[PDB]
Known about the structure:
Number of helices of chain D: 3
Largest sheet of chain D: 2 strands, antiparallel
CATH architecture of chain D: Orthogonal Bundle
Number of domains of chain C: 1
Family (chain A): Belongs to the V-ATPase C subunit family.
Number of strands of chain D: 2
Largest interface: C-D, 47 and 56 residues
Subcellular location (chain A): Cytoplasmic vesicle, Secretory vesicle, Synaptic vesicle membrane; Cytoplasmic vesicle, Clathrin-coated vesicle membrane
Shape of chain C: globular
CATH superfamily of chain C: ATPase, V1 complex, subunit F
Organism (chain A): Rattus norvegicus (Rat)
CATH topology of chain D: Helix Hairpins
Number of strands of chain C: 4
Distance between the termini of chain D: 30 Å
Number of helices of chain C: 4
Structural class of chain D: mainly alpha
Largest sheet of chain C: 4 strands, parallel
Strand order of the largest sheet of chain C: 2-1-3-4
Radius of gyration of chain D: 30 Å
Helix content of chain C: 10-25%
Protein name (chain A): V-type proton ATPase subunit C 1
Order of helices and strands of chain D: HHEEH
Oligomer: part of a larger assembly
CATH class of chain D: Mainly Alpha
Radius of gyration of chain C: 14 Å
InterPro entries (chain D): V_ATPase_D
Amino acid sequence: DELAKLDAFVEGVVKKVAQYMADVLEDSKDKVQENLLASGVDLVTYITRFQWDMAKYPIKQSLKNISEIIAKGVTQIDNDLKSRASAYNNLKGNLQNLERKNAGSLLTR
Amino acid sequence: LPILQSHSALLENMHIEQLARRLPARVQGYPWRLAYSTLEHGTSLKTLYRKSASLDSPVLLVIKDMDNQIFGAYATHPFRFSDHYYGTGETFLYTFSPNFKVFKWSGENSYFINGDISSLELGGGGGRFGLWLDADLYHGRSNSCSTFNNDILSKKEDFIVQDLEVWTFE
Amino acid sequence: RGKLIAVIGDEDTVTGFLLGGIGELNKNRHPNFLVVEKDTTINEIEDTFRQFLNRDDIGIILINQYIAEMVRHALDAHQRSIPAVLEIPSKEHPYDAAKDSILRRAKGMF
Amino acid sequence: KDRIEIFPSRMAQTIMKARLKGAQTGRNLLKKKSDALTLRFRQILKKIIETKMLMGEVMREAAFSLAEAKFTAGDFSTTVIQNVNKAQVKIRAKKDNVAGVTLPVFEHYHEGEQLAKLKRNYAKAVELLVELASLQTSFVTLDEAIKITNRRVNAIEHVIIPRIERTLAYIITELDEREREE
Amino acid sequence: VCLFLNLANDPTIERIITPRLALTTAEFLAYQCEKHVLVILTDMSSYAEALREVSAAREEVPGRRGFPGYMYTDLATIYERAGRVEGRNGSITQIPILTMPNDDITHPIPDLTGYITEGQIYVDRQLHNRQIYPPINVLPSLSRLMKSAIGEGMTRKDHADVSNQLYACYAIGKDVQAMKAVVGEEALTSDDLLYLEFLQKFEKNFITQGPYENRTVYETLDIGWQLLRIFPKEMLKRIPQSTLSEFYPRDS
Amino acid sequence: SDPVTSATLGIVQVFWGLDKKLAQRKHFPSVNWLISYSKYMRALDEYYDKHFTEFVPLRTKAKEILQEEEDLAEIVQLVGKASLAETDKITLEVAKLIKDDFLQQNGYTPYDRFCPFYKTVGMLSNMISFYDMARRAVETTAQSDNKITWSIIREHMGEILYKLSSMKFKDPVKDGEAKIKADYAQLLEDMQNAFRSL
């Protein structure tokens, strides 16, 4: 049960940090997909050649302890994305609002 | 590109460049905040634990001895009291000898970090420690330990701390 | 086993703090709460408060502040710290801040 | 009585001097205990009023949630007040310790969509009620402990120390009288 | 060393003579042979015992608390055979050693000695029972002429500052240690925990010494700085920023 | 106080003082261990170094425990014990073990009519070994979700407390040096095994 819930969270986080990278890069899905990578190789290569990363997620921990390591790491990334995305989006929003006041009526320009 | 610290009295742009290139993906691009410094918070191991007790992120130990040689460790978990070893294999020891060298985990055993009430130590493999510091942060020792397969981190196996900093990535 | 949150007040304020899955009737079938209907005698309010205030089932009593002002005689006389008595709001009323029988100990300090 | 009724001797001087340091030490340690109890007390006072400010929000929102849930469903209050039975949400009684005083506190535990929004908003509200009740029952207990401690400090300063000092002065006087007789 | 021994079963008039032979030798060595002399007089309470015994043989009436009425004049005749004098390079310094009955400082012997001499160093039964040596308590101890002994060209420039800051931290640490059992250590501030760490390290490193261990004033001052470095320099209220700038950091 | 005592203390190298609190609590021998003294200890420490080696540390630690508890015994009259830390409760309760099961001695019963020095060092060695391990268990479990208390140690180790309090009953007329040492050494192993089982 627990891993089945946890997977449906980490998939959500991976999709958020990829979706937001397309928005920050502004252009197109293909140009982003060309640069979706793990360890410096494309997703197909990484999933095909998987070897367990026992520096990060140690093999001799209990299955419950490994679960909590992976949950804490992905939780931190979800939080730090939220902060970094808020902080950058505000600049873009406010700068467009100044352009909307270079534009607009003589009554508000 | 040289990373965004809030200060440092031990390190220099020679050391910050060479360190920022080695730290794990887990901290690449974070600003470095000073958690503890013997030169600002007063010199004791109880203070180093007390200042580290609120953290939940990696730290960089930096030491300067009475020969002015800089060395330390990057540690995946805060320095805290423990009855058993803790930390994970991204932990490493480093030394400016005067070349920058880094001794990443060998794969041999999981003896990364430990902390008694009266000393703090990193590494293992027999009676060996890669780094050991006393309750006063006065005496310390380094030997080759099989967790990292390090050289002697100081000029001498037994050293005296001139000053010490702990940075954290927050 | 635990402890219960007793309630005295308007019928909606007795439905609130109950719909959350809260409050029982004990072995004597006496409920954890009373509705103050518009004709309720001041005795029925203070005597039901006195019954909840001396029942081992209970840890907290919630009382609308306008009826806490009616039971003000027995209520401010409660010097014990065993149960808590809370002078809660109602839809029709100012919120719980003023007069409070416990808070008023700090008579120049809040 | 003005004095402690020991009989004049160098042994009595030794005893009364020991008592005087004991009482002056006891005073100063109990004054410290009063400051320690007072610090926690004024902190939980600020948390009492701050919990009450949060109650001034969420109880209104829960009452609104009940009005909206009733507007959605027709009513609940006619039925659920009569249909009383076993309950799933309750309190555990709990303790804390402060300068050797024990303070009472409480812990919350479990044993149309407007009704679900309602249940969440009343859950928020009762967590503030458990919080306030904990702080207030602690505060009442702690107020009494401050009053008791201050009463002891005043008794050591105004009843006990003067009685020892009068006794000590009498002993020092009678030893000079015995010496003049000799 | 010149050594004069009077045993507990020697004639008691030799005990009256002993301080006077000693100080007559110190006066020759200091004011004629130009030496700096330290005179140690061991158990003045054993001298006062014999002084009372001579007075009783003269059939004189016992004075106050049993001792002779002139005992102030008699002690002052021993103690004031001391000091520097104009035109001579020698000097006499004295350390009278005393034993107090019932550990009571108000007895005539320690009382009258306090009106003639200029300080006291105080040996403590609680430090002795905790197995510390030397068991000297620095709180009731005082040297009244200390300001004239210490400082630049006579010891080191920081001695006046370091002595005052160590005393302050020891006094505060003793107060925190007393309240720790009243409130429990979980009630203590981070500031209180620095003082309670200083207290334990002061008594182990500074006060405790070997009976065959010899420290210069410089080892004494340097052990002082190793303990003051427990605190952030902004907590060192008694030390001026000029002294802290030169001495607080560890040197290479 | 009096002139005969005052004159005597100027001369004698050892003084043993009575405590009326011990005598009126029928604790024997009723000697006060805080006003008494001996000035021979530096002369004897070379004999203890030659013949025992361990005893000088034990004597030292026992006097520390007995003095540290005498300050706690003043403060608990004000605060009623509640504030006291577990290391310090450990220190109260072991001080009592020393007072009742080492310093107390029945003068008429055959097993304690004369306590030889190999029995004397054996008893105290075990009590100080208990103090170290019991205090270490509390201190090592500070800053932790599981924290050891005197009550936990008392619940886990009641047989070791019963054996420690019973160490006095060994009779040097009935049992030889080898048996009395082996019995005390087995208790030291029972202590270590109990602490290793915690």
